[PDB]
Symmetry: C4
Subunit: 230 residues, 4 copies
């Protein structure tokens, strides 16, 4: 289509996302830089804390948007739902733009607030973990994103975007970070990966960026399929 | 307005808050001192543990004081709801006093049960990080409180596990910047008991930041 | 009174408790040794882990009992509920015995798996931790137990005219938490008992004079905290 | 009763399990190597993080299935339910095969990815630990599995399972059991990593990770008799 401009109710939805993806990148990267600025060892929340920031914020945010926009906060979630015709192309694109914009903004106030540490320690930016190759990173993003989007589909509440459960993704995000943080820093979310690439602006991070789009999009589509066979 | 002194139903609500905010500052600062007061590199709950004490106690307390007073435990929550024509001025003020009083009470005891450790380690009071500025602290309190009050509004059900979390999360980001306030009574209580010039000097941030975050919090649900 | 020795239905309830309090002391003290027994820097689940074992097991166990016997797992919970007369004297006593017995068994079952570690690493006992005095310990047990029993009262519902054990999920996640939280504040003070059976079981198995000397605190503190709460739910 | 293959409404269920047990062994062992590899003091997730990966993934996965396959992800869960004729022998066997296969794939997906560090750190496979004997390990698997299956039975419905309980019921057992047996309680989970890691010591201990959970499961089931 291309004529779904049903006033008020939607150019709102795209703003529900915005503000959402914003406080998502804030909190998390606000906690990922918190990590490293560490003068003393075993004195921060630790990677476990980082994993919780990501999972816990997706639980909180999907709870808050749930019946307003649906609660995507993530272009690969939007893409999976699109690829099932559970949303339209126009809504999908509007959402993805609002998410990528919000993401950039979040890793901004982080920047201001926290200067020096932001460019001193990875900048929440996602690059391939020293040691593994691009194929491994990609594979880990695929599977990671599959776990997320498989949970979302089952998190689809049938009562024309659908509602979404949260404690499940809360967890479905948390879990993937526990496995995936070492290898890539864990993305599973093209807007999250894009935002910090824009703000951190490093050649190495831009070089790896394609993985954080292609891996999640594939993992997401593989979901619509698992939800096609069955 | 003097429009209310209701037989039961309210001079109770202000007591639901009291006792609530009390065990809130107890538990937490009771856990913020028994980490600092540590001799085993690792053995202390871990900042992560502190963050859980704050989030987990707000989950428990809002659960208990849910249908009994609105479950505020926090003047910035009360203020947001007030600025929402969801609470009256008189109730709001009574709540904030009951919260600030309960908060003071919480700490005092911690500092009786363990005067030494408490005294020797910053009294769990909320100050400014030893490497940033007042503008950053304020900004971090604003945003932090926005995350909390935005969750509360959506946590209206004409309610817990969400704030449990909404508090927990903000502490994970904010503990290294201010100590994570987002709660003027929590910040006031330990300033009263710890009584340090540096902590009193920064105290305004823990009122103004949350009140602002709350007000932009009230209104985001205005353009939605 | 004395007639609720109702075939099946109850001499079962007292067994629901038993088996419960058993796997409670197992898991936890099974995790309190499994930490104290380290060699590598920060290689144990962490005290945070211990706090979770206690809170998380009370969530799981109250979930499993609930509509099978109420889900007490704790003489101070039973005592608070008794002091509201919503569990008769006879049921109360039967519960407390079943809890204290189960507790001994659990722990014992650990000293049985990790004979060596156990003793030499603290015994999973509840004492006064170096530094503080008996008055502080008592105060911390009182308040700690108040937080627990206040949560329980509010964790009570007028829901069972039809069925429970399978109802609109909540009742356990609150205490899960209400136990977890108190351990985060109280572990450094007296390891946190808030549970006379939990404190009794490991005192029986560990059998140290210092732990027996402090034991009264783990009965009197929780009973007071329970009554204080069990009163706050009258004048509230 | 074997009169059951009725096209789709099942050769699917056995695939719900497959894909489930797969991402279960992935995530976890993907996090168990992830822990063990990290150099730095207080770096990776922490044993606490590992315990969460196991518990949290069973919560997520039982949430995603259950309502359409029962949500077993575990031969000892299937076995307990079988003893309590709430499942047939044929379904039970099909499930256990699908779980053991998925597990191998998951473990085998972990390795041919982060192999270097992988092979260096016990493949995350279930073993015994320098401190306790076989009797202790077995006892700890029995009891551990009892806690799990007792929760499952109560996690049953009159209308299927409710997760946050097992989420937790798995998490808790790992906090107690990781030191002694790196926590088992799941024959497919133990089998998968034994197949991929392929060490003589791990194959020697493997029987414990079948017999312990099966006993713990039966004891639990039979608790739905005298209860």
């Amino acid at each position: 289509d291309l004529g779904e401009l049903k006033l008020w109710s939607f150019w709102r939805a795209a703003i529900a996302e915005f503000i959402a993806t914003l406080l998502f990148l804030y909190i998390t990267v606000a906690t990922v830089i918190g990590h490293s600025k560490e003068t003393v060892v075993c004195g921060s929340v630790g990677l476990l804390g980082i994993a919780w920031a990501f999972g816990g914020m997706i639980f909180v945010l999907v709870y808050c948007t749930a019946g307003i926009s649906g609660g995507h906060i993530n272009p690969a979630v939007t893409f999976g739902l699109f690829l099932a015709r559970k949303v339209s192309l126009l809504r999908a694109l509007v959402y993805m733009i609002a998410q990528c914009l919000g993401a950039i903004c979040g890793v901004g106030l982080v920047k201001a607030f926290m200067k020096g540490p932001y460019n001193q320690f990875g900048g929440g930016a996602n690059s391939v973990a020293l040691g593994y190759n691009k194929g491994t990173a990609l594979g880990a993003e695929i599977i990671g994103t599959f776990v997320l989007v498989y949970t979302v589909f089952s998190a689809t509440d049938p009562k024309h975007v659908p509602i979404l459960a949260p404690l499940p993704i809360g967890f479905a995000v948390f879990m993937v970070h526990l496995a995936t943080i070492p290898i890539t820093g864990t993305g599973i979310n093209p807007a999250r990966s894009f935002g910090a690439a824009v703000i951190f602006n490093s050649n190495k991070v831009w070089d790896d960026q394609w993985i954080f789009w292609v891996g999640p999009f594939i993992g997401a589509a593989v979901a619509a399929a698992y939800h096609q066979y069955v």
